[PDB]
C-alpha cells in the first residue's frame, strides 16, 4: 500500500511541478524589472546624498568587468527602512 | 551438510542475531535482481526542480518539440500507468 | 558610470492577482501563452543582462493580461468556485480541492 | 471501580485538547480562514514576497482575485 | 571582510592561546582543542553558506568527523596517564625539552 | 538592524573567553555548551539549518556528555570554579576586555587594523538572492555526499574504523 | 523572531519557578541539617574517584558510532539524487563498517559493557 | 498575538503533567487493587494541585556541601527544554513548521540528560554521583540505537519536516510497514525517559531516589515536573509518527481530538508496564541493547535503505 | 597485538601518506595526515611502558594542535580566493600559519622539543619508524607548496633546526635522543634549499631515509640503546660495531662517501642564487654536528671499553631473525658517491 | 612529489570536489561563477607564474566577487556621508510608502 500511495503522490509531486515551472518566467520579469527599478532609485539618491562630495563618480562599477552582476542584496538595501531590511534577508528563516 | 547444523546450533542461541544476518544481507543481495529499480532511478529524471531553459531553433533537428507540447519529446504516460 | 534604463522607460502595468489564484490557472496559462515566454527565457540565459531583454519581459506582461482577460469573460464563477477553494490551504497543494478543477475544465474546455 | 478512574484521565485530555485547538484556530483567526501558509523553501517564501505587497493592505491574507486586474 | 568572520577567527585565537596556557591537569587541553576545532568548523560552514558552493557543504561535517574523531582518541591516552596518577601534566618522566 | 548574530558572536567569544581559561574541565564543558548553542544559532542565521543541528547535536549532544566522564576519571577534590584563582579569573578578564577592544572597534565603525582589514558594517550586507526551486541548496548539498563523492565517504569509513581498533588497541594493553 | 521568543519565555518561566521555589518558604536553615546525606551516618569523605575502563571502553565507542550516524543523516535526501547506484553501494557501505566495527568489538572481548 | 499562543501552549501542557501524575497515582493504583488517591477530590482530582503546594511551601534547603550554581541551573535547563521540545509538534498544526523538526526533537532530547549529569555532580553526594554516572550511561546507550532507527523510519516519509509525516500516512499507517523499528523506537523511549524496566536513574530500592536525592522541595519539583513532560512528549511524538489519522483541513479539531486519544493510549501504557516488570540493572541494560537491539537495528536500517530502490517507491519530499 | 592487526595499522599508515602523496585537493591532505595520525598513535604503545604512554602524549598532543593550526590556515585560504586546488596561496598571514604547521609535522626548531624526547620512550623499531616514515607527508606537502614560500621564514627554521640540531646533539649518552638530534638537524638541511630547488630536497631527503634506515637497523641487529650498552658489542660480533663507525661517517658527510653528496649538492643550489653567506655558516655548523657522531665512534669500534664477563656466554650464539633490507641499505648509503649524477632521475 | 596517479588513471576521484563550477548537482550555480570561469579560461598554457601577471585582473573581479570588499567600503562611505546630511537632507518619502509594493 504504501508503494501505491507513494508513487500517486509522487505524480501529483511532478504535476505541481509543472505548474511553478509554467509560473515562473513572468516572475522572473517581475523581479527583474523590480530590481532595475530599486538600483536606478537608489542611483539617483545617490546623486542627491555624495554630490556635496568634490570627488566622487557616481555609481561607478566596481569591477572593471563589462559583465551584469545582479548585486548583492545589500547594497540594493542600502537606505530602505530597518523593517523593510527584516523583510530583505532574514525575512525568511524568520518567518515559521 | 554439517554446516546446516549448527545454524540450528545458532539459532536455538542467538536467534536476534541471526535474523539480523539474515535480512542484512538479503538486503544486500536482493536489489540488483529487481527491475523496478531501473524505473526507480527514472522517476527521478523525470522531476524537474530547475526549469528547462529552451533552446533555439536551428534547422529542424527535430526531435525537440517547439511548443505548444508537440509530440516529439519523452514520452511520460508510462509513469503516469505506475 | 553603468547604463541603466530610465525609472520610467521599464514601467509597465502589473499582472496584480493573487498568487494562489495565479496558481489556480497558470497550468492552462503554460499551455495557452508560450511563444513570448520562451522566447523570452531563452533570450534571457542567452546574453545575461536582463536590460537586454526587458522588452520581451513587457510584452510578456501584456500578453498575460490578454489571457486573463480571455478568461473573466467566460469561466469566473467556476473559477473563483476552484481558486477559492485552493487559497483555503497553505500549502497551495492541488490535492486538497480537485474536484472543482472539473467544473473549471470542463467549463474552458466547452465554453472557450 | 475502575471506571471511576476515567474523571482522572478526561480531565488529561482536555488539557492536551487545549493547545492542538488553540493554535489550529489562532492562524485562522489572524490568517482570516486562509489557515496559515508554509514557507519551507525560498521559492514559496517568494510567493509571500510577491503578494502583501500586491494587496493594498501589507496584511496579505486577502487575495485580491480577477477583479484587480480591473 | 565582514565584522562577523573577524570575531570567529577572533575567537579561534583564543582558542589556540587556552591550549598553549596549558596548565594542570592535561583534560583542559582536550576541551580547548576540542574549542578550537568547532571554531573552525563554525567558521568554514558559513563561507560555504556564503558563495553558494554547494559541493562544500558536504566538507564540514567530514571536517567535523575527523577533528571529533582525533579528540575521540585523546581521552584514552588521558586515561592512561589518569591510569597511573590521577591526572596531572606537571609530571612527565621524560627528559630533554 | 538587530544585529543578531553579530552579538551572537559575542556571546560566542565570551563563550571561549571563560572555556580557554582553565578552571576545571567541567565548568569548560559548560563553556561549549553555551558557544556550542550560540554556534548553531548563529550558523542558523545564514539558513544552513542542517549544520548548525549537526554540532548542536553531534557535537554537544555526544562530546561534552563523554567530557562529563572524563572528569569522574579524574577531578581532584576542590575543583575550581572560574573565581577560584587569580592567572585564572585574571585570564578571564584579560579576555573580556581584549574582545571587548573589539567590540570598541565596531563603535569606531573603521576597518579593522588588526591581524588583516575587518570591513565593518552589518552582516546582512554580504547576503545574496536565495532563490531556488522547492529545496534549500544545502539539502542537495549534502546529500551529494553520497553520489556524487564516494571516495571521501571511503576515507571517512576507514577512517573511523580503525580508530575504533586504536582504542582497542589502546585500552587492552592494560 | 519566533523561536527565540519562546526560548525566552520558557526559560523566563522556569526562572520565575525557582524565584517562587527560594524567596518563600522563609524559615531556617542551619548546619548538620544541610549536611550532604548519606544514608544516615556521615560520609566516610567527599566523593573522589569511581575509576573505572568499563566506562570509557565502551562509552568512546558510543561517540565514533554518533560521528556515524552523523554520516547517516544525509541519506533521506541523498536517496532523491539522479544516479542511485552510483550512492546505493556507499548506503551499504558505511552501515556494513558500523556493523563491522561493532562486530571487531564483539568479539574481542572489548564490549565488557557495565 | 503569537505570544498568548505560546503561553496556550505552555499552561495546558503543565496541567497535562500534573494530572498526569494523578492518573499515574490512580491506574497504578488499580493494578494493584488498591484504589489509588480518593479521599480529598472527591475522585481525587483536587489533589495534585494540594502536592505541588505542598512541595513549593517547603523549605527548599541549599546544600552545605553543594556548590550552587550548577545545583540552581540544572533543573531549570530541566524544564526549559522539557517544555521547548513540544513546540514544532503537528497539532495538526505545528507551532512552528521547522524544516526539519524532527532532528531538532533529537536535539533537545539529546541535551536533557546532560542536566542529569550536573544534578548528580553538583550534588556531591556519593549516591549523587553513582547514580547520576549511570544514568548517562543508559541514556547515551540508549541514543544511539533511537536516533538510528527514527533515521529509518524517516527513509520513507521523504524528509525531516514532521506536517508532511501526516500527509505520509493517509491511509495505512506507518506501524504496519515497519513495526519491529516500532518495537525498538518503542522500548528506546521507554529507557530514554528512564522508566519502568529500564528504571537507573531514580535507582529506587537500588540507590535510593538515586541523583534526585539532595534537592529537596522546588527543584525536585522541576525534576519530577520535566520527566512527565517527557514521558508525554515522546508518547505524542510516537503517535504522530506511527499511528496515522483522517484529518480534514476544513475540521482540524477533528484531528486533535483523535490524536490525545492515540497519544494517551501510549501514555497508560507505560503506566502498565510499571506495574509489571522489574528493573534490569546496569548490566543487562546495555547488554540488550549492543548485543542484541542494535544489530537488528542495523539490518532494518539496510533493508529500509534498499526497498524504495527495489519497490521503485521513493518518497517524494525534495 | 597480533601481527594481522598489527599490520593493518601500518598499512593504514602507508596509506595515510599515499593518500598525502596522490591527492590534489587540500581536505584530503589535511585528512591525509588526520588518518596519518590515528594510526601513528597506536603503534607507539606496542609493549607499553608506564613511560611509553607519556611518550605518545607528547607525540598526539603536538601532532594534533599542528594539524589544527594547519586546517585553519587552509580555511583562512579560501575564505581570500575560494580554491582547493594546492597551488599557490593568496594571504600571507595565511601562509607562514601553513609553513608553521608543516614546520611543526617536520619537527622543525623551535618547534623541535618533542622529537628528542618522544624517541626515548620507544623501541628502535617504532622509532625508526617515526623518524623515516613520518618525514614524508609534510615533506610530500611542502615540495608542492614551494612556488610561495616566504623564504625568509623558511631559512630562518632551516638554520636554527640546524644550530639546535648541532648543540643538544653533544650532550647526550643513550643513543636514540642522539638519533633524534641527527634527524632533527639534516631536516634543516632539507628545509633549507626548499625554496630554492625542491629537486635537491627530495634527493636530500632518500639520503637521509637510507642512512637513518642503516643506523636503526644495526641498533637492532645489535639491541644497544644507551652509549655503553653499544660500547661491548666490538667483542661481541665485531663486524657490525666496525660498520657503525662508517655509517657514522657518512652521517658526517666526509667527503668520499655518500652523505657528502647532499650537502655538496645543496651548497651548488644556493650559490646559483648567491646567498653565499648562509651556506658557509650551514656547512660550518654541520661539522659542529659530525663531532657527537665521532665521540659516539669512540665509545664503540676504534676503542675497546672493559668487557663483562657475563658475555662470554652470548658468544655461542649467533644472532637471528635477520633483517634483510639491511645490507643495500649500509651500501647505497655510503659507496654511492660517484653516481651523483643519477639525481637527475629525479628530474 | 605530488605523484598525480589519479591523472594518469583518469580516476578523477578526487578532482570533482574542487573549483566554484565544475558540475554540481542539480547545476546549482556558484555565487561567483562567472568571474571565475573567465579567470580560469585565462588560465591554461599560461601556467602558474606569467598567470599572476596577465590574469590579475581577473582574479581582482573574481576577489571582488568573493568578499564584495570595495563596494564595502563604498557603501559604507555612502552611509556615512549621509549622516553629515541628515540635517541638512530628508532623504526620499517613498521608502516609507512608495509604489515598491505596488511595484510587484
Ligand atoms: C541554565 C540556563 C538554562 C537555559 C536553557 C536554554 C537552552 C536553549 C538552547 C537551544 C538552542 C537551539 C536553537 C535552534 C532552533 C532551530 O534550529 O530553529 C529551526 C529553524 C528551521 O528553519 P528552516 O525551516 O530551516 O527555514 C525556514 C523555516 N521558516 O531555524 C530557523 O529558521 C530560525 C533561526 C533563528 C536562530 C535562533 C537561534 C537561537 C540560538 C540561541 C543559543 C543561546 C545559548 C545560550 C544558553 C545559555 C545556557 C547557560
Ligand atoms: C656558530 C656555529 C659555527 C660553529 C663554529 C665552529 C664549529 C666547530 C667545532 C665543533 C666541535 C667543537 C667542540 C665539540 C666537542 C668538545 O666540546 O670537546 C671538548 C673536550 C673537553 O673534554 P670533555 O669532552 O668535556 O670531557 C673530558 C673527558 N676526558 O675536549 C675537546 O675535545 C676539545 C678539542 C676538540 C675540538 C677542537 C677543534 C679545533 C677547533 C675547531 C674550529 C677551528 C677552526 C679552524 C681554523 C681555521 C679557520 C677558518
Redesign the interface.
Known sequence: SMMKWNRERRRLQIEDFEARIALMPLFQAEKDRRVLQMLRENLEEEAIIMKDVPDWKVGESVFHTTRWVTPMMGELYGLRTNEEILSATYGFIWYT | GRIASFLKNAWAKEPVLVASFAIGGLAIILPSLSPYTNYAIRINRATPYNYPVPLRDDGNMPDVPSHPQDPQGPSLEWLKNL | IVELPTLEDLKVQEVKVSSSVLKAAAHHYGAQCDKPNKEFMLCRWEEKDPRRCLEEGKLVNQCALDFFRQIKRHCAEPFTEYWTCIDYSGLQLFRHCRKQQAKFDECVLDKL | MWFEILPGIAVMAACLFIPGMATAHIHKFTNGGKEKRVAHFSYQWNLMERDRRISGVNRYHVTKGLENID | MPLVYMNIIMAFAIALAGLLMYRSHLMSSLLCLEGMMLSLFIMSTLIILNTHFTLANMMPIILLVFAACEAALGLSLLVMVSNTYGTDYVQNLNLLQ | ??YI??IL??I??IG??G????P???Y??L???V??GV?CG????????????????????????????????????YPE?WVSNK?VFG?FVS?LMM?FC?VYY?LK?E??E????????G???????????????????????????????????????????????????? | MNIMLTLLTNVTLASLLVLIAFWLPQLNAYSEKTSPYECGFDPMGSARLPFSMKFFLVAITFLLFDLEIALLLPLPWASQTNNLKTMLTMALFLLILLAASLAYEWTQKGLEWA | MFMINILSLIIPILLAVAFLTLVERKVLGYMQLRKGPNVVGPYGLLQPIADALKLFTKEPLRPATSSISMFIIAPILALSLALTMWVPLPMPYPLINMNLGVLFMLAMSSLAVYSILWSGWASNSKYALIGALRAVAQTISYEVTLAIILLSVLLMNGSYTLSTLITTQEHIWMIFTSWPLAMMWFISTLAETNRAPFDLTEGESELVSGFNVEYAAGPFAMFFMAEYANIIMMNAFTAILFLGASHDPHTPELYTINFVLKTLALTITFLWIRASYPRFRYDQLMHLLWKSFLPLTLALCMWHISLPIMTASIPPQS | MNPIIYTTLIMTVMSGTMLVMISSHWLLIWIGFEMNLLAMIPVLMKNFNPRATEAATKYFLTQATASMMLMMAIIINLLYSGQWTITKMFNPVAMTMMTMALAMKLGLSPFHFWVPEVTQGISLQAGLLLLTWQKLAPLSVLCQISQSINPNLMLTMAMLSILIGGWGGLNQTQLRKIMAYSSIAHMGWMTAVLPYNTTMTILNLLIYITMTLAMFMLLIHSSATTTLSLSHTWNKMPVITSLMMVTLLSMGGLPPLSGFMPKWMIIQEMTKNESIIMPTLMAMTALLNLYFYMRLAYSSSLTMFPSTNNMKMKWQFEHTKQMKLLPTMIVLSTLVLPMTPALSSLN | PFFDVQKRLGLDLDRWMTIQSAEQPHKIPGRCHAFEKEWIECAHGIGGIRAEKECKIEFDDFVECLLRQKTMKRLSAIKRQRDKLIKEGKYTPPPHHLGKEDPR
Open positions: 538592524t538587530m548574530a553579530f558572536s559575542t560566542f567569544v571561549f573567553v572555556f580557554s581559561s582553565k576545571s574541565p567541567i569548560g564543558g563553556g561549549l555548551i558557544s556550542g554556534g548563529i550558523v542558523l542565521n545564514f539558513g544552513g539549518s542542517f549544520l548548525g543541528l549537526m554540532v548542536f547535536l553531534i557535537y554537544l549532544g555526544g562530546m561534552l556528555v563523554v567530557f562529563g566522564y572524563t572528569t569522574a576519571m579524574a577531578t581532584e577534590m570554579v592567572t585570564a579576555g574582545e573589539m565596531a565603525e576597518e579593522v588588526i591581524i588583516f582589514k575587518f570591513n565593518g558594517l552582516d546582512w550586507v554580504i547576503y545574496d538572492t536565495g532563490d531556488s526551486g522547492f529545496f534549500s541548496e544545502e539539502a542537495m548539498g549534502i546529500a551529494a555526499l553520497y553520489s556524487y563523492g564516494t571516495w571521501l565517504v571511503i576515507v571517512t569509513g576507514w577512517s573511523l574504523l580503525i580508530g575504533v581498533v586504536v582504542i582497542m588497541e589502546i585500552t587492552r594493553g592494560n
